Amino acid sequence: RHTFVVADATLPDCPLVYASEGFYAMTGYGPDEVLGHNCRFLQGEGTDPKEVQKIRDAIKKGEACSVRLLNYRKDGTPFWNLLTVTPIKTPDGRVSKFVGVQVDVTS
Template structure:
């Protein structure tokens, strides 16, 4: 029965989609003593090219040395460890490898081997980078929109402030009794209401885009025709 289970385990390890390796850490070079077919396909190397070598030959210029140090430290302490690092295939193509290493304890209470489980997560990393790049572009686009809205808000605010000042000066000079001037002021009042609504909408858009902290302090304008102005409808 034990022999049958052993054969089943051998078949299971050989059939799994993850790359499985076994390293002899009792040797100074900690060479590979077993690799399954998935690891061969993942790296592009044949079994005869892998056995007897340390896995470090899969490393390259983009391999994070800090992640490699984590593996080395875990083995020295006889601990489990999971890292994500760039490795290189036989043809030079790089791939992202999620590697988990675990000590294999023997009956003699000595750790001679380490099992490594490797998973190619290149597609996940590529997708994550696309999401990050898209988010950055979206943030930049939103920033451009905020700047445009802020500039528009400021321009309208200044123009309407000037118009408001003119209206007030006309009222102070008591020339609003003139029918034509009264009509002009009434039209300004009507236009101002529309512009005020536009400014409010612009401010709401800026708040939605996160630009509220940089809003220009421009008050809404209110034009008032003097109470003693002639009725423009007469």
């Protein structure tokens, strides 16, 4: 059971431009509150800053990255999100999109 989102890297702050049906149902947010925004709205108090940094650097360096983050639903309840971000480049080597597979690993 996984969800899938696409982030536009041609825009500076990598806003989300497509999310799967499961992503909305897992987090409780609608497309009116997800599209056009950065995925960081899912984070909160217990989210490890050290893990968030691993993603920030991989995006700035144009690499892939797999982290385990604590995220929060719209109702504020926490869940554990195994996140894997993958860069998508053009033939000139420039990153156009970042793609993400999110898995709820709360078991």
